[PDB]
């Protein structure tokens, strides 16, 4: 039985003969065929592309082990990867019809590390087209929640790793791989009671990952426990000699430390009990716990959509935060209610607060380049680097098919995305400039880091804060949010459409660690607790999250996917 089993217990069974790599692959496939495939009562639709060589790779794992030569701690451990990941031999559509026949000619760096370690990819998980959204249906549709069919498995507007969240929580594999541009990593993890880690810039190479916004894309591993997440990072986190596609590891204007310089000697050693929280100071933004009436009191708040508006947290989510704060205080930690200039100075939600568009730290022309010229190059250079003879140029892509609207669903609120994605093909036909010749890049990248220094780094120092904590999301949107107007208003509200922090978290290179905060008593939906801190302080944040996880049993098995 593999339901809610840890990597250590699986490796333990592999070394004792109680199971084999092949038998683990078959155990997970039985749960996929019983809960994930179409025609089943649940039909969660998380695993959308199968790896036909999973059994062949599993047989090779048992052959290496029978010979007393395991490749390492993850030899024979199944996992899933977001459809944005390049997995050699399999398609890489990014959930988009226009790329449905694109074949990965090689692996992504995270997949290359796992394959060399003997880990076997069972398949790829669902996502909206190009990760440009959350719960919108792509070429493979969308994934459903294993905790409550009446609610989404991820934020509707930014939660593109919805398949990775559902699959990991339902034990369709030992762990999962996700990706985040806004909240596509923290979002799905929150609704499924998962542990997630968004690293600082350049810690995990994004080479071989379908980009969305090269300045913000990061690799996000999923795990049902902090122990499992540390098992994963111990293998994937390593220096990558090939920097192609990774903008932050290519640019020379801003210094970025090597991954081998940021990572600890042993990630599993970062685990600790409640002692790691004694004498620590943690700040919780009032805006994420229904304690900031000043949010949204400016003349024209926000920078588009529901940004810059007051967040109404669900009462059942407040009750879990109250018990989470009590656990922190009982462990000797100090929780302080504070402002959050990182969000307020980005969205201009109160009088005097500037926005990223008018503050002057980054030019307006860079923000234009950041989402048009720079992203079009990201799409084009990814196709050129992969090198599929059938499709290796963005100019040769069916534009209108990159993100076609789902007929019968409510129109997108941010704006039209069918013609918006086709525009990137128009730019590729007129000529795309590469990353290193975009004039606004040197000032923009230095301005992004400076923004974090003022709003977060120096801010945390003068407040003597060790980390910043807050509920990952304020509420969950109903599953019918795509067709029900009443549900759309809930799902598209601030704090719900996107995990707390909106774009400023990923825009400024802020590391985060998310852990389950508990399950809502009313609707039985999990909600997470996010730990954020200074850049490249990742080891401390991972330790804090592991310490908080040890003080409670805040994860349950999804009721829709019981053990077979």
């Amino acid at each position: 039985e593999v339901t809610e089993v840890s990597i250590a217990e699986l490796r333990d069974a592999l070394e004792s003969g109680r199971t084999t790599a092949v038998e683990l692959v078959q155990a997970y496939l039985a749960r996929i065929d019983a809960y994930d495939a179409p025609g089943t009562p649940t039909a969660l639709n998380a695993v959308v592309v199968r790896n036909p060589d999973a059994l062949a790779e599993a047989q090779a794992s048992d052959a290496r082990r029978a010979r007393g030569e395991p490749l390492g701690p993850l030899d024979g451990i199944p996992y899933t990867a977001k459809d944005s990941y390049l997995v050699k031999g399999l398609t890489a559509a990014s959930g988009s019809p226009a790329f449905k026949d694109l074949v990965a000619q090689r692996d992504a760096f995270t997949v290359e590390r796992l394959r060399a370690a003997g880990a076997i990819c069972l398949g790829k998980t669902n996502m909206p087209p190009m990760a440009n959204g959350g719960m919108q249906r792509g070429v493979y549709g969308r994934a459903e929640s294993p905790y409550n069919a009446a609610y989404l498995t991820a934020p509707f507007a930014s939660g593109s790793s919805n398949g990775a969240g559902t699959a990991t929580a339902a034990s369709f594999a030992a762990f999962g791989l996700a990706e985040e541009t806004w909240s596509s990593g923290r979002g799905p993890a929150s609704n499924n009671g998962l542990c997630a880690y968004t690293p600082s810039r350049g810690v995990i190479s994004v080479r071989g990952n379908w980009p969305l916004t090269p300045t913000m894309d990061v690799v996000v591993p999923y795990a049902r426990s902090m122990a499992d997440l540390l098992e994963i990072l111990d293998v994937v986190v390593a220096d990558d000699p090939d920097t192609r596609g990774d903008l932050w590891r290519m640019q020379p204007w801003v210094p970025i430390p090597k991954a081998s310089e940021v990572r600890p000697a042993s990630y599993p050693a970062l685990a600790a009990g409640a002692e790691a929280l004694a004498g620590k100071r943690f700040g919780v933004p009032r805006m994420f716990i229904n304690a900031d009436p000043d949010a949204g009191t400016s003349e024209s708040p926000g920078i588009g959509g529901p940004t810059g508006q007051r967040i109404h947290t669900r009462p059942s989510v407040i009750a879990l935060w109250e018990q989470a704060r009590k656990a922190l205080e009982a462990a000797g930690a100090e929780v302080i209610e504070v402002d959050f200039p990182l969000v307020s100075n980005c969205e201009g939600d109160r009088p005097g607060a500037p926005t990223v568009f008018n503050r002057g730290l980054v030019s307006k022309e860079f923000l234009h380049d950041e989402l048009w010229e720079l992203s079009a190059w990201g799409f084009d250079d990814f196709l050129r680097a992969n090198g599929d003879p059938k499709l290796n140029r963005l100019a040769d892509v069916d534009g209108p098919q990159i993100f076609p609207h789902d007929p019968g669903t409510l129109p997108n609120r941010e704006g039209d995305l069918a013609a918006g994605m086709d525009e990137y093909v128009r730019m590729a036909e007129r000529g795309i400039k590469p990353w290193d010749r975009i004039a606004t890049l040197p000032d923009g990248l230095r301005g992004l880091e400076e923004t974090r220094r003022i709003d977060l780094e120096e801010w945390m120092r003068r407040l003597r804060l060790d980390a910043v904590l807050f509920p990952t999301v304020a509420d969950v949107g109903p599953a019918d949010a795509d067709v029900n107007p009443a549900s759309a208003d809930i799902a598209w509200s601030n704090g719900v459409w996107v995990a707390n922090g909106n774009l400023a978290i990923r825009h400024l290179g802020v590391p985060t660690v998310t852990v389950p905060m508990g399950v809502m008593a009313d609707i039985g939906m999990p909600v997470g607790l996010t730990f954020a801190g200074r850049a490249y302080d990742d080891s401390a944040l991972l330790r804090f999250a592991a310490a908080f996880e040890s003080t409670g049993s805040r994860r349950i098995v999804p009721p829709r996917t019981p053990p077979l």
Partner: peptide, 6 residues
């Protein structure tokens, strides 16, 4: 909700 700052 997904691309850069818009």
């Amino acid at each position: 909700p997904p691309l850069a700052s818009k």
